Amino acid sequence: MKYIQTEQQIEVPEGVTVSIKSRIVKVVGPRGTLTKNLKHIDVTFTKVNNQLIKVAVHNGGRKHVAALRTVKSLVDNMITGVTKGYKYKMRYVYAHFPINVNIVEKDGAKFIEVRNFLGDKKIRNVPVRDGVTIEFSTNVKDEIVLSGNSVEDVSQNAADLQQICRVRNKDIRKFLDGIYVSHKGFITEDL
RNA sequence: GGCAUUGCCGCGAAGCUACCAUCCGCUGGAUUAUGGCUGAACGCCUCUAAGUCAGAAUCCAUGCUAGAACGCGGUGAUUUC
Numbered sequence: 001m002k003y004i005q006t007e008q009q010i011e012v013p014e015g016v017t018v019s020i021k022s023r024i025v026k027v028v029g030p031r032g033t034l035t036k037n038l039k040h041i042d043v044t045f046t047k048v049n050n051q052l053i054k055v056a057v058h059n060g061g062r063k064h065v066a067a068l069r070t071v072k073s074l075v076d077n078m079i080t081g082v083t084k085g086y087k088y089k090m091r092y093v094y095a096h097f098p099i100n101v102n103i104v105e106k107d108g109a110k111f112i113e114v115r116n117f118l119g120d121k122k123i124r125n126v127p128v129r130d131g132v133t134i135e136f137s138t139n140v141k142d143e144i145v146l147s148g149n150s151v152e153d154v155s156q157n158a159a160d161l162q163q164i165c166r167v168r169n170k171d172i173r174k175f176l177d178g179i180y181v182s183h184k185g186f187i188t189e190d191l
Numbered sequence: 192g193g194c195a196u197u198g199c200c201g202c203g204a205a206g207c208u209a210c211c212a213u214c215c216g217c218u219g220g221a222u223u224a225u226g227g228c229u230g231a232a233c234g235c236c237u238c239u240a241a242g243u244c245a246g247a248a249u250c251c252a253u254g255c256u257a258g259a260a261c262g263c264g265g266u267g268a269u270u271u272c
């Protein structure tokens with residue numbers, strides 16, 4: 001249909017500064033600085049009042065306007081990650097063999113090490129992406145917590161941990177063992 | 192010692208040679224299917240549309256062979272008459 005103009009609003013809270021040169025977005029907040037290259041989308045950013053950015057697509061087709069809202073969501077996630085942070089809680093699930101998850105170092109590289117998954121003698125190692133913090137939750141049995149500014153990095157680190165523990169050659173409806181994301185929220189409570 | 196078209200027999204070094212002998216046969220990246228992340232379209236959802244993770248005896252490299260006889264480089268010496 002080639003809609004004349006489509007636009008989305010990105011709300012900027014008080015303690016956040018958004019610097020957008022051509023299509024490289026830098027978001028600065030209390031928790032840190034995030035950066036995203038969006039030169040692949042052909043959108044136009046415009047600051048309105050220092051609390052509102054508008055992102056627009058002119059003469060855009062269906063896919064172009066579909067990507068506009070994706071741009072808005074990505075910038076919103078950047079802002080949410082520098083203000084509230086992102087935290088993913090994963091639970092270990094096993095029928096018989098306890099899963100042994102720890103943090104080890106290889107040349108100072110901070111791997112999540114998984115042993116005894118379904119009795120395996122193989123040691124699985126999932127690197128920790130920079131910016132992601134791993135904390136093992138006390139008062140909850142078999143819970144690993146991944147926290148960070150970038151939802152992309154924390155969710156991909158959690159997904160790597162989940163994927164490393166896929167069951168092979170078994171009915172997965174029965175052999176349900178693995179490390180599964182049980183919660184995805186923010187670092188700051190009740191916000 | 193000759194001849195017997197290598198006269199025949201045993202052993203027989205060298206050379207050649209046998210899964211009949213011994214040794215040796217490399218590790219990186221990009222991918223497929225697929226499973227995912229974020230994420231709209233479609234206020235939800237969604238691996239997909241933008242972006243993106245992993246991933247096959249695959250592919251391209253590393254490695255190995257040849258070296259273009261009209262591809263190239265470096266370097267030595269270049270004729271007293």
Ligand SMILES: [Mg+2]
Pocket residue numbers: 169170
């Ligand atoms: Mg079976």
Ligand SMILES: [Mg+2]
Pocket residue numbers: 194
């Ligand atoms: Mg005679």
Ligand SMILES: [Mg+2]
Pocket residue numbers: none
């Ligand atoms: Mg004779």
Ligand SMILES: [Mg+2]
Pocket residue numbers: none
């Ligand atoms: Mg999701």
Ligand SMILES: [Mg+2]
Pocket residue numbers: 239
């Ligand atoms: Mg795509």
Ligand SMILES: [Mg+2]
Pocket residue numbers: 259
């Ligand atoms: Mg030649």
